[PDB]
Amino acid sequence: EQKNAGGVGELEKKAEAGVQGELAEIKKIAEKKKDDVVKILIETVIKPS
Amino acid sequence: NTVSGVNGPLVILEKVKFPRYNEIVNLTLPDGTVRQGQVLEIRGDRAIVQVFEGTSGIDVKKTTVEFTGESLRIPVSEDMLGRIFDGSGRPIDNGPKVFAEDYLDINGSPINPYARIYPEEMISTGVSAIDTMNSIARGQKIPIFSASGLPHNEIAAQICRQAGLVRPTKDVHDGHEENFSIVFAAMGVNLETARFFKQDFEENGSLERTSLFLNLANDPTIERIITPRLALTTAEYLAYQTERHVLTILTDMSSYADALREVSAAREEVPGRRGYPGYMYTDLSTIYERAGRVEGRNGSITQIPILTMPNDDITHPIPDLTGYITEGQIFVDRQLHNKGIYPPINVLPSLSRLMKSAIGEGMTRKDHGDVSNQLYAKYAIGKDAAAMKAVVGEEALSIEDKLSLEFLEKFEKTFITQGAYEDRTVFESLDQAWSLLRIYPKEMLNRISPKILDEFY
Amino acid sequence: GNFKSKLKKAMLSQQITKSTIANKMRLKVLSAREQSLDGIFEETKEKLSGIANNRDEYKPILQSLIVEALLKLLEPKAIVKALERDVDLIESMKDDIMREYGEKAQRAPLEEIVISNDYLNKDLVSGGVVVSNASDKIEINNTLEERLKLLSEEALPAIRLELYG
């Protein structure tokens, strides 16, 4: 039980560590093609959505 | 234009008739609120709308409307798994929304490509009393019908936790080769109970693979009736796109009936059979068309709907239509529950139509269906023999009744009694059947062929 | 016997933890995806103000927003609500709006454009119109901020799939 109230912290270290690679490719590929989606957003907005 | 008048949660709008059916309307009220609705009716410069939010707090000529230009279609993703939702598809954990990757109709089936190859390969749930006596297939719909005051929800929990601990041993035998996911719909289900279903999903390993939809009866009727359809669109999308068997646990069927009943009284409809809607068929049927194998025939939606009997009768319209549209039923009997049997699955009327059309070979015996026929027929005979024992007394009874009396007693405490975190294999149930069934001579065992019978009694 | 039930129970408490952590884990992956998606919309709307503050590039857009708005009205008289820097732009193209509207419907051209004495936020709202009937009870909020917000509903599935599928 002691490993179910103090060894469940390390299980949460391991959930933090596995997404710091994701939170960074998220920002990579969002930043590149950001500009290409805006152009589609503008022609669409000034016409019917 | 403005709200002309409002009747219960249907609102009479005066508005131009150009909008298409099911298109969202937004009423801008002077309270600051925006409330969303669906045109239930379009008429000549007027509409009848069901409001999503609310049922009241709606002004006459001070309230105004705006059109979306968009039909009611559910934004469905597969990023909605591993997260807890309300009955209208929004997190209650208040984090990022459902979002979409498609929009799918709930007003009519999208693709409708159901089964041209009969569901025929077995699904095991770890229960002898279910799986043997009623054969489950990938796309088949068998419902659990229970009575008021019973723990319908606890039996549904058993089904969830043991299904998916069977699957890797079943994977070897052939019955899965694909991801398994749960789509769980509550209408009219208690907070406590819901919290039990989440715990069930933790145990199994499919809290990450399930979507939970919670509507309470203290949330509008209009939200409540969307909740099963939202469940179905979610479940057929996983099933379609990445070829997954989704098992749908839809509790409770009468709670859904209840809401239909209130927007019938509020409609210009007359209620037919016993105060329930005269279009009660169309409602139920919308749910049941979606179930069966979907395109590519490695995706499916399998249904166990849960019904609690509102008056505790099997003459009441709800179970009677529902039973006709579905393939069989599983009965729970009150007398069992009180005695402390678990699961209290009384097999006296429990039968599933596909029994020799839900089995094959290489994972089931072909004898599997045949064995079921002995078990069901003897159970009944036994049940009759016990009825005569109660009246006449043993001395009066003949030899045939005594054997059968004995069979019945053994059946209750051994077959339908098993643990609640205890899995079973279909092979294993049949071997247990053979011993118990072995209490009669060959003259009397004649609901199975002499070849198979000679081997095993 | 009963050690196994309680051992199983604590072993169920063990995967009880395992699931809440693995759920929060994907809730972080997903809420980052949106933090960036709403910075694509952040770009869009700096563009929308910059165009709105043009008076020559903005006219063919503005006209099309009033005209489209009129097709989702279809009423004989319309009142058109705008920002006080778009009113003079409506004023110099009225004839063109009643024409373009009449051409795109079976209906004969609109009688009157009444340039409303109501004013939309200058802070929150940039360009576009709220087009309304004679009595002002049917409104199409056909502003640029609004149109972006309505496009977000359907634009979103397309974008989540190409970047993230």
Added chain:
Amino acid sequence: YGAIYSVSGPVVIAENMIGCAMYELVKVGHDNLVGEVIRIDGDKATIQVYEETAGLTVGDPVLRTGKPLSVELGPGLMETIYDGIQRPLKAIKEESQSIYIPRGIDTPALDRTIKWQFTPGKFQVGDHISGGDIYGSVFENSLISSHKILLPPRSRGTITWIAPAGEYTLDEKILEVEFDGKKSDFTLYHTWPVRVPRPVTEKLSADYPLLTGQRVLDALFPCVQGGTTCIPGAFGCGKTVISQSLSKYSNSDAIIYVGCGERGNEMAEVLMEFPELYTEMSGTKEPIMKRTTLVANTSNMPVAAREASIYTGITLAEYFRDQGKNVSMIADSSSRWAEALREISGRLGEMPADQGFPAYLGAKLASFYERAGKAVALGSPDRTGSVSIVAAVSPAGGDFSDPVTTATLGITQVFWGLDKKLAQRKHFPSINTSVSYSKYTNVLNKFYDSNYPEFPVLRDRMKEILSNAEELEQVVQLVGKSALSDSDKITLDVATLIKEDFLQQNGYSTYDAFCPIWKTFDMMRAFISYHDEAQKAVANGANWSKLADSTGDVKHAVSSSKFFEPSRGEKEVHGEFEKLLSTMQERFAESTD
């Protein structure tokens, strides 16, 4: 055209309608959805648009076809699966990538792209023709020609052009008829409105057998070609099974399988099963499916399909009757049709009648059964054809007191009940003497008598033995068996053997699913003979117990006869049943002793 005034649920009102009838087919909107004008109130006509009205834009045009809802009669119906509005579902699979119709579907109401083989008949140029006359044939049955091509009813004349043999499409004209000038050219198919029956010269007195092939059903109350049958069903009653039996075993040349809005999983099953099955007539190329045409619809699949299903499926049976074919039309399940009338009255705003089901229910059902019968074929060669209706219904009140069962029963000539108590003991199809009759029985048993059986006498006795059994059983239950003769036990004992052995016949094989007239005779003959001999045995000395104990294995020998195939012995009578008579007589002497 028309202009859509309101779209309210699946009810649509459009104004500015002209030339509209009361069951006229219309296509609604730019989508062109299936609809039908139900009523007209002033200039505005209420049309129920029953294929998904979702996303229907209002102010679109509504187009009249100028005639009511129809079916297409002619080549390609066999080995092809349709819906109840008669659009081909099979066509939809290749293009849409969908089994069932969604919406926007505007495919023609028959496949006419394909070619079928035209053979001229016994007509030549300058020869006279009249409707229902056999102008040629197309081979599409298991063994015979299926789609025999007719001059359409209500035309006569002399044929100017007879095209010779060869392959042509549906579309291509190959016939010209002149009467009073050019009547029209004719093509391979014809159309016919479904709310009108196709004409006949005359209907004939049904008097010939319809084999069902279930032992119990044929025994107690056998069917005729041209009968009407009512069956209540509560799910799990083995409905599918008896339906499957009929399509194989019946002596009818055509089976038309009708899904009146079903599960879909159940429709797939029967479908898949038919090509594997082999015909008893030495079938080919998907043997049984070649004699099968499927109307298959799904539960919430368009309410036009469900309502129309029964009318379209009987119209197809009638075309086939006019060529002089025997058809068996199995409607499955018409309870759902009854539910469709419940809905049609409520949505429209009409008031219904008893128990929320309208009274228009009753007339509309009666018209449907009357289109059936045994018949002398339309047209001048004269042949006999049949349309024989066997229709399932169900409760709706969890009784047989509900308006649905009782109305359909009012009209019917054959009644085959439903027994929940017997169903538990594993009996299917479960019937009882007290809940079933056939007014055809008298004439039918005489017919069966000719073939070899002792059938008339045995049927009288079959009824009596089960009716006496029921009364006795009430006293045994309540009072006891110990206040009652050994003899009264004997009636129950013999009766039990009949209960398991007849009633359960759902089969786990073809051998346990098929029961010819000879085999049905044989099993009944051995049980009555046992009864007569047993009562003697005990009466001159012999206890009950001793008799029960002694016969023992013999009770079983008849029990197992169903599991064994009927192609065995001399013909269709087992050597096991032949021996069984000697064993019976040999047994009475020992029991008595």
Added chain:
Amino acid sequence: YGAIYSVSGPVVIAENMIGCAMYELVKVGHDNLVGEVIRIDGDKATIQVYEETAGLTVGDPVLRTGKPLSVELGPGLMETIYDGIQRPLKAIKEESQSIYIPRGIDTPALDRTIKWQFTPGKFQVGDHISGGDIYGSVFENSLISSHKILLPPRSRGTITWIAPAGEYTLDEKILEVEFDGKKSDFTLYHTWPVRVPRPVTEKLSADYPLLTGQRVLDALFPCVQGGTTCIPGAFGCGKTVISQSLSKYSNSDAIIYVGCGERGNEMAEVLMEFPELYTEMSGTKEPIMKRTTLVANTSNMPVAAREASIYTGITLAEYFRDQGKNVSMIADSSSRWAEALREISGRLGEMPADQGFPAYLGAKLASFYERAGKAVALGSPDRTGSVSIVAAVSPAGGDFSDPVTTATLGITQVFWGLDKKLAQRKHFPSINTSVSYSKYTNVLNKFYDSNYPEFPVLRDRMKEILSNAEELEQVVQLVGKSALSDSDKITLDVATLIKEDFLQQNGYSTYDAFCPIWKTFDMMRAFISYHDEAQKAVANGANWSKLADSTGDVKHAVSSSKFFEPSRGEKEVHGEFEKLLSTMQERFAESTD
């Protein structure tokens, strides 16, 4: 605002509503009777006016109150008897000289005589405050404070004016909060709409019991607080009696008493008995009455007040759940309550549904039980409360299978019966082991086991003994005593001692009405120890009569434990039970030998 168009019976129709919410509270005409706008068609509203319209004319104005039908819940709720629209009835008695209200006259919902002492919370000048955060507190009785003033839900901001400590009136403001401008002014009371339930951070699964201390209630089918419970009645054959018992033994932070629509002799009785009674926690100042706030409607009093009654109670109760108070909610009766609805439905001219009772019924019953339960209050402090709803039902139409009762058993997790014979014998609640169940038991036995008790093992055994006892008596009738022996005879005897000690109570003593968790644990420990050792002793050679006579002193002393003090071994711990274990061992030696 509006002009009366029409008056048709008790329904009033008023035209020229150009904005009026469909829950809006209204005063109609110049009589100024209570009404609420049920529906609206156009500018004509349908308003049900819940008092008589004798003297009301068409052509009189109807003035909107400017807010929906809501109730203010403040300090001073305690020691007051109210209607469901909330009018103080004691006040009416003062002025008019009657406990019933005069129509066309109303009075302020909360008393305005009362002034209460406000002391500041912890948010001071310019501090940010957020929903459910405690802005102050007010005394709600002299003895104790209980009404903590939190910031209203749906508000948040910075507090620009915080009044200093002192006594203020309900009328006068104390706080203004700024978010978006001055958002509005706040008072010591807050209003919350009656059909809108107050909010929480999240709800929990209750595992916490009631503080009733009713021994059979605790042990056999454990009381839950944060639960839903259905109790049979038939009126004054025990059911009102138990509700009065429940009030007495209970010592919850608040208790809210709801007479949904009772006989009015019963409402009078509740009011008078309570201030003479004593709280079982040993508090003072009209004891039970001080902790009870009473919404007491007889069925004669308007139908608005009957329908609003449950609503007003649940919202009030839920707020107390947000305050961090554990509430016992007693409703009497839901059968009456379903009837309030059916009445309204027929008047208006809408169709009611199943059994003549409305469509809206089921959703309304259901919402009500699910609203009650254990939660952590809204806001940063996160105090724990509970709302336990125990609703009484009787037969309605005289059948107890009708929709109302049957709908409610399905929702319930707790059932405790009532029987006329058991009620005569003074067993209250009148329960056995099959007229009662609890599914809350599982979590609850687990909760109690943690506290120190050996509870789960002992409780299961309690149920078993009662079940067995019943069963051995039947055998004595049919089979005889030949199937009876002394082992069985001890089983009958233990059940008798368990019935007398647990089931029978009526408050003969003060120690017969509060018995702690630890005391209840100790009674069941004596009786199970007697059982197992009596059986062992008769097996090594002893007789029932011999065991009975021999156990004697101990047997007498443990039956009488309810009359005996529960402060004997400390304050909750009873010394006699601890000394029983040793006596029992020496005793077992006397019984065997």
